[PDB]
Design an enzyme around this catalytic site. Structure first.
Site, PDB file in Angstrom:
ATOM      1  N   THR A  48       8.495  16.765   7.464  1.00  0.00           N
ATOM      2  CA  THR A  48       8.203  16.608   8.970  1.00  0.00           C
ATOM      3  C   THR A  48       8.486  18.051   9.719  1.00  0.00           C
ATOM      4  O   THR A  48       7.831  18.403  10.672  1.00  0.00           O
ATOM      5  CB  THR A  48       8.954  15.364   9.694  1.00  0.00           C
TER       6      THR A  48
ATOM      7  N   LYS B 134       0.693  15.262  10.563  1.00  0.00           N
ATOM      8  CA  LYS B 134       0.888  15.896   9.443  1.00  0.00           C
ATOM      9  C   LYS B 134      -0.018  15.452   8.378  1.00  0.00           C
ATOM     10  O   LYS B 134      -0.562  14.598   8.457  1.00  0.00           O
ATOM     11  CB  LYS B 134       2.322  15.624   9.045  1.00  0.00           C
TER      12      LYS B 134
ATOM     13  N   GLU C 226      13.096  25.369 -10.106  1.00  0.00           N
ATOM     14  CA  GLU C 226      12.412  24.564  -9.327  1.00  0.00           C
ATOM     15  C   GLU C 226      13.212  23.329  -8.922  1.00  0.00           C
ATOM     16  O   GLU C 226      12.828  22.624  -8.074  1.00  0.00           O
ATOM     17  CB  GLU C 226      11.599  23.772 -10.559  1.00  0.00           C
TER      18      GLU C 226
ATOM     19  N   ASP D 225      26.090 -22.697  -6.060  1.00  0.00           N
ATOM     20  CA  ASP D 225      26.564 -23.510  -7.351  1.00  0.00           C
ATOM     21  C   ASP D 225      27.631 -24.521  -6.893  1.00  0.00           C
ATOM     22  O   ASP D 225      28.922 -24.365  -6.898  1.00  0.00           O
ATOM     23  CB  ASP D 225      27.225 -22.352  -8.259  1.00  0.00           C
TER      24      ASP D 225
ATOM     25  N   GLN E 293      24.385 -22.510 -13.265  1.00  0.00           N
ATOM     26  CA  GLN E 293      23.012 -22.931 -13.469  1.00  0.00           C
ATOM     27  C   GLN E 293      22.622 -23.313 -12.006  1.00  0.00           C
ATOM     28  O   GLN E 293      23.448 -24.002 -11.145  1.00  0.00           O
ATOM     29  CB  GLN E 293      23.069 -24.107 -14.310  1.00  0.00           C
TER      30      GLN E 293
ATOM     31  N   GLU F 184      17.624  24.222 -17.436  1.00  0.00           N
ATOM     32  CA  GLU F 184      16.248  23.243 -17.209  1.00  0.00           C
ATOM     33  C   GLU F 184      16.820  21.861 -17.661  1.00  0.00           C
ATOM     34  O   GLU F 184      17.871  21.607 -18.360  1.00  0.00           O
ATOM     35  CB  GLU F 184      15.134  23.644 -17.966  1.00  0.00           C
TER      36      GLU F 184
ATOM     37  N   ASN G 258      28.788 -27.306  -8.527  1.00  0.00           N
ATOM     38  CA  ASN G 258      29.386 -27.841  -9.446  1.00  0.00           C
ATOM     39  C   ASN G 258      30.307 -26.462 -10.385  1.00  0.00           C
ATOM     40  O   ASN G 258      31.470 -26.799 -11.037  1.00  0.00           O
ATOM     41  CB  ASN G 258      28.978 -28.547 -10.794  1.00  0.00           C
TER      42      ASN G 258
ATOM     43  N   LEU H 221       0.854  -1.130   0.130  1.00  0.00           N
ATOM     44  CA  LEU H 221      -0.107   0.109  -0.082  1.00  0.00           C
ATOM     45  C   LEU H 221       0.738   1.364  -0.118  1.00  0.00           C
ATOM     46  O   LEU H 221       0.364   2.400  -0.542  1.00  0.00           O
ATOM     47  CB  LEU H 221      -0.859  -0.019   1.104  1.00  0.00           C
ATOM     48  N   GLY H 222       2.248   1.204   0.700  1.00  0.00           N
ATOM     49  CA  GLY H 222       2.958   2.272   0.562  1.00  0.00           C
ATOM     50  C   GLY H 222       4.015   2.123   1.777  1.00  0.00           C
ATOM     51  O   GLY H 222       3.863   1.221   2.607  1.00  0.00           O
TER      52      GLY H 222
ATOM     53  N   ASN I 227      -0.637  11.747   7.382  1.00  0.00           N
ATOM     54  CA  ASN I 227      -1.107  11.035   8.557  1.00  0.00           C
ATOM     55  C   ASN I 227      -2.793  11.155   8.275  1.00  0.00           C
ATOM     56  O   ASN I 227      -3.632  10.379   9.436  1.00  0.00           O
ATOM     57  CB  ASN I 227      -0.913  11.296   9.778  1.00  0.00           C
TER      58      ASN I 227
ATOM     59  N   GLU J 299      20.745 -14.371 -15.044  1.00  0.00           N
ATOM     60  CA  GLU J 299      19.639 -13.582 -15.779  1.00  0.00           C
ATOM     61  C   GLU J 299      18.463 -13.464 -14.805  1.00  0.00           C
ATOM     62  O   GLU J 299      17.755 -12.621 -14.549  1.00  0.00           O
ATOM     63  CB  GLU J 299      19.041 -14.619 -16.920  1.00  0.00           C
TER      64      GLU J 299
ATOM     65  N   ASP K  33       3.714  13.797  15.614  1.00  0.00           N
ATOM     66  CA  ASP K  33       4.000  13.851  14.375  1.00  0.00           C
ATOM     67  C   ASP K  33       2.833  14.037  13.421  1.00  0.00           C
ATOM     68  O   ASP K  33       2.690  13.450  12.225  1.00  0.00           O
ATOM     69  CB  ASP K  33       4.872  12.470  13.894  1.00  0.00           C
TER      70      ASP K  33
ATOM     71  N   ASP L  26      -1.454   6.440  12.912  1.00  0.00           N
ATOM     72  CA  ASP L  26       0.244   6.513  13.828  1.00  0.00           C
ATOM     73  C   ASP L  26       0.044   7.209  15.013  1.00  0.00           C
ATOM     74  O   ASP L  26       0.980   7.552  15.656  1.00  0.00           O
ATOM     75  CB  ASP L  26       1.281   7.264  12.998  1.00  0.00           C
TER      76      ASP L  26
HETATM   77  C1  1FB Z   1      -0.757   3.775   2.626  1.00  0.00           C
HETATM   78  C2  1FB Z   1      -0.163   4.231   4.145  1.00  0.00           C
HETATM   79  C3  1FB Z   1       1.025   3.860   4.273  1.00  0.00           C
HETATM   80  C4  1FB Z   1      -0.379   5.674   3.717  1.00  0.00           C
HETATM   81  N1  1FB Z   1      -1.270   3.956   5.111  1.00  0.00           N
HETATM   82  N2  1FB Z   1      -0.919   3.675   6.361  1.00  0.00           N
HETATM   83  C5  1FB Z   1      -2.001   3.352   6.929  1.00  0.00           C
HETATM   84  O1  1FB Z   1      -1.737   3.404   8.303  1.00  0.00           O
HETATM   85  C6  1FB Z   1      -1.431   2.454   8.893  1.00  0.00           C
HETATM   86  C7  1FB Z   1      -1.485   0.933   8.409  1.00  0.00           C
HETATM   87  C8  1FB Z   1      -1.526  -0.418   9.311  1.00  0.00           C
HETATM   88  C9  1FB Z   1      -1.008   0.107  10.835  1.00  0.00           C
HETATM   89  C10 1FB Z   1      -0.793   1.364  11.157  1.00  0.00           C
HETATM   90 CL1  1FB Z   1      -0.332   1.627  12.735  1.00  0.00          CL
HETATM   91  C11 1FB Z   1      -1.117   2.366  10.201  1.00  0.00           C
HETATM   92  C12 1FB Z   1      -2.849   2.987   6.221  1.00  0.00           C
HETATM   93  C13 1FB Z   1      -4.381   2.419   6.413  1.00  0.00           C
HETATM   94  N3  1FB Z   1      -4.735   2.041   7.734  1.00  0.00           N
HETATM   95  N4  1FB Z   1      -4.953   2.006   5.308  1.00  0.00           N
HETATM   96  C14 1FB Z   1      -4.810   2.441   3.991  1.00  0.00           C
HETATM   97  N5  1FB Z   1      -3.468   2.969   3.939  1.00  0.00           N
HETATM   98  C15 1FB Z   1      -2.459   3.254   5.070  1.00  0.00           C
END
Ligand code: 1FB
Length: 454
Positions: free
Chosen positions: A171, A133, A410, A323, A329, A438, A325, A14-15, A136, A374, A131, A152
């Site tokens: 932050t 922001k 920029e 590996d 491979q 640029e 031998n 998710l990120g 969050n 590969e 934190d 968080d």
């Molecule tokens: C995608 C991301 C990292 C911003 N994020 N964080 C999330 O925050 C989380 C996700 C799992 C555990 C904790 Cl403590 C925080 C989150 C969520 N609950 N649902 C969908 N995306 C979530």
């Protein structure tokens, strides 16, 4: 003990968030979907002992408010903690804002009321965020009337902040002065919320500067103004609220609860209604958001390149040693074992939570190969993919007029936010022997590669 991968299988990444990667996971029995944050004990220190983390988790699991992320479970093994909670699919608040036609004080007030409402409630239970922001604040769903969920809460009390600029991007704008000097309480969350309010109404940070440390200097001094032209479009009661929230001495600073009773909140959140669009605020927020995300993508790209080098050679070493031998491979089974071996050494990749997940990645790599060198190249290119595409999409988004180029001005802004050295980035450019002032995307990418030893 109970084991995380006995219960949940990972679906997709998710990120990246504070303290680790976040994975979309599914309960193998009930089919419940959840978001799992995977915190590596090797990259993140604990500030508190076991007992204190356990009691804090036990509390968080019991709490319930519509503007606060729901936590369901917590696991811990040799190398990781797993925080399992409710998944939200509406993305970050600011990304929903910048895709709007109109945005008024009314929309701001409705945002801030929700934020202050969750905070108020967490403070009554003695939990401080620290934190807070924009990243969050997630929108609960893609819907129009969706609630904001704060993620968080409580974590920063238990886990030490990263010093890497990868992890600290953006932050410094939000952090309360008193958190910088060591003596802080719940009032720090009101300050951060007033910073966010300032940005919602002007599109610009109240405390800004050319690099991280310059920003922190502004915060520590604590002076800001309402001198930008777009503040003329703003009610005086909003300015009065901001002043109370950005009061320097925390004991003089307004509480979250008291801020919900402020005249601005009362006035502008009436269902009744009783109001212009802050089009300048929205333009600046669109610009701010693109800059932050491009700088963030630039660092992750560079970080991913260093990791890729580190793991490419290590996998090669593991496979050479494997590996028996020496012919270069290996069969399906040795590949799996060697890949697993790589992950004991370098820690589990967020998206490879068990032995089954490694096999499918191997089997995916093999489907594109159908010789261990590969395999190595293909497997590593697949781990860089997300970084290299995030960078390109982040460059395209930042290039709002679609000129295909970013100017030197920029670049200054981007590299300042990324906290890369003015003289250092200018030197990498020069190695643009023609000074258009640029760079197009390929050149920008070459600059980053050169700033991480490639
Ligand atoms: C995608 C991301 C990292 C911003 N994020 N964080 C999330 O925050 C989380 C996700 C799992 C555990 C904790 Cl403590 C925080 C989150 C969520 N609950 N649902 C969908 N995306 C979530």
């Amino acid at each position: 003990t109970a084991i995380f991968s006995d219960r949940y299988k990972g679906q997709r990444v998710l990120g990246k968030g504070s303290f680790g990667e976040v994975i979309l996971c599914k309960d193998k029995i009930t089919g419940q979907e959840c978001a799992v944050k995977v915190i590596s004990k090797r990259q993140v220190k604990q500030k508190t002992d076991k007992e204190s983390l356990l009691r804090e988790v036990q509390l968080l699991k019991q709490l319930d408010h519509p503007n606060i992320m729901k936590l369901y479970e917590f696991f811990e093994d040799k190398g990781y903690f797993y925080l399992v909670g409710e998944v939200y699919t509406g993305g970050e608040l600011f990304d929903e804002i910048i895709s709007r036609k109109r945005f008024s004080e009314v929309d701001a007030a409705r945002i801030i009321r929700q934020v202050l409402s969750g905070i108020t409630y967490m403070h009554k239970n003695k939990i401080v965020h620290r934190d807070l922001k924009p990243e969050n604040l997630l929108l609960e769903s893609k819907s129009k009337d969706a609630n904001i969920r704060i993620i968080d809460f409580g974590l920063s009390t238990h886990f030490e902040a990263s010093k890497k600029m990868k992890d600290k991007i953006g932050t410094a704008y939000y952090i309360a002065p008193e958190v910088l000097h060591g003596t802080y309480d719940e009032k720090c969350d009101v300050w951060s919320t007033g910073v966010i309010l300032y940005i919602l109404l002007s599109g610009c940070p109240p405390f800004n500067g050319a690099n991280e440390y310059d920003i922190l200097k502004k915060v520590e001094k604590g002076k800001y103004t309402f001198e930008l032209p777009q503040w003329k479009k703003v009610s005086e009661s909003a300015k009065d609220l901001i002043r109370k929230m950005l009061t320097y001495v925390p004991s003089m600073r307004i509480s979250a609860r008291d801020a919900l009773d402020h005249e601005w909140i009362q006035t502008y959140t009436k269902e009744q209604i009783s109001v212009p669009s802050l089009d300048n605020a929205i333009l600046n927020i669109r610009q701010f958001q693109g800059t932050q995300k491009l700088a963030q993508a630039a660092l992750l790209y560079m970080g991913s390149k260093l990791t890729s080098q580190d793991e490419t050679k290590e996998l090669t070493a593991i496979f050479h040693k494997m590996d028996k031998n020496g012919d270069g491979q290996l069969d399906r089974a040795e590949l799996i074992e060697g890949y697993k071996e790589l992950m004991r050494m370098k820690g589990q990749d967020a998206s490879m939570l068990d032995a089954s997940a490694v096999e499918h990645e191997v089997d995916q790599v093999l489907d594109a190969v159908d010789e261990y060198s590969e395999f190595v190249t293909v497997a590593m290119d697949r781990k860089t993919l997300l970084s290299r595409e995030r960078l390109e999409r982040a460059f395209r988004m930042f290039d709002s007029d679609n000129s295909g180029k970013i100017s030197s001005t920029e670049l200054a802004t981007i590299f300042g936010v990324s906290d890369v050295d003015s003289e250092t980035w200018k030197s990498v450019l020069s190695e643009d022997k023609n000074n258009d002032g640029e760079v197009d995307f390929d050149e920008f990418q070459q600059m980053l590669l050169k700033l991480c030893g490639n």
